[PDB]
Amino acid sequence: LMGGFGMKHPPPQILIKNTPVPADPPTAFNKDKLNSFITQYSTGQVSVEIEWELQKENSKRWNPEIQYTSNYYKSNNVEFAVNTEGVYSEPRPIGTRYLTRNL
Amino acid sequence: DGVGSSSGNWHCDSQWLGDRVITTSTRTWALPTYNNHLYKQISNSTSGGSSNDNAYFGYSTPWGYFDFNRFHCHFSPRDWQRLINNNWGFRPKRLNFKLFNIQV
C-alpha cells in the first residue's frame, strides 16, 4: 500500500554483530555469566549492486512529453547538491510517472 | 509496372537503436507548371531594384525541386525531445529518397 514491489521472499535480512570480548575474569570460578566486556565497535564498507530490468517507451505520440527537469533559474544552492556546511539535501520528492501511455 | 498497382507503401515510422536513429517520412506533393515551359532571365530591372546592393541577374526555370533540409521535416516534436534530452551529439550518415504513386 505504501509502494514498491511486494514479494513472498524478499531479499533476506543481513544481521551483523561484533562478538563480545570479555574483560579480565576473576581468579576464583563463579557460576554467573560475565557482565563485564570491552567497549568496542567495528567499521567497514558495504557494496550493494542491483540488476534492474527496463521496459522502454514505445510511444507513437506526436507532441512532446512532459519530463523531469531542474528549473534553470538562479539560486543560492544547487538542488540535490551539498550545502556550504557540507550537508546533502534533497529539495523535493520525485515521482516515477511522467511518460504517458494510452488507457 | 501498371496503372492499377501501387508504386509504393506509405512508411512514416522512426526507429531508435542504441547509437543510431532512422527517421522515415512520407508526404504528398503537387507539382504545377512553371513559367509556361520557359526560361525567363529574371533581373532586378524587371520590377524596381533601384538600389545597387539589391542588384541581381539570373534565370527562372520551369523545373522545381525538393527541399527537405529543415529539421522539422524529419523529426516530430517528440522524436526531437527524445533526441536532445538523451544525447550529446549527432550527425547524419545515410539518406534515401523515393518518389512513387505518381498521378498526372
Q: How far is A43 from chain B, CA to nearest CA, in Å?
A: 40
Task: Enumerate the residues of chain B whose CB falls inside 8 A of the CB of residue A67.
Answer: 81, 85
Exp. method? cryo-EM
SS3 track for A6-43 = CCCCCCCCCCCCCCCCECCCCCCCCCCCCCCECCCCCC
d(CA B68, CA B5): 27
Chain B residues in contact with chain A using a Cβ-Cβ cutoff of 8 Å? 76-78, 80-81, 85
Cβ of B82: how many Cβ atoms within 10 Å?
Answer: 20
- For cell 576473576, the residue is A26
Element (H, E) at B79: helix B77-86
How do the residues of chain A divide into helix, strand and coil, expressed in percent and rounded to 5?
Answer: 0, 5, 95
Contact state of A62 with B77 under an 8 Å Cβ cutoff: yes
Task: Enumerate the residues of chain B whose CB falls inside 8 A of the CB of residue A101.
Answer: none
d(CA A17, CA A19): 6
SS3 track for B31-75 = CCCCCCCCCCCCEHHHCCCCCHHHCCECCCCCCCCCCCCCCCCCC
C-alpha angle B90/B28/B2, rounded to 5°? Answer: 115
Cβ of B44: how many Cβ atoms within 10 Å?
Answer: 15
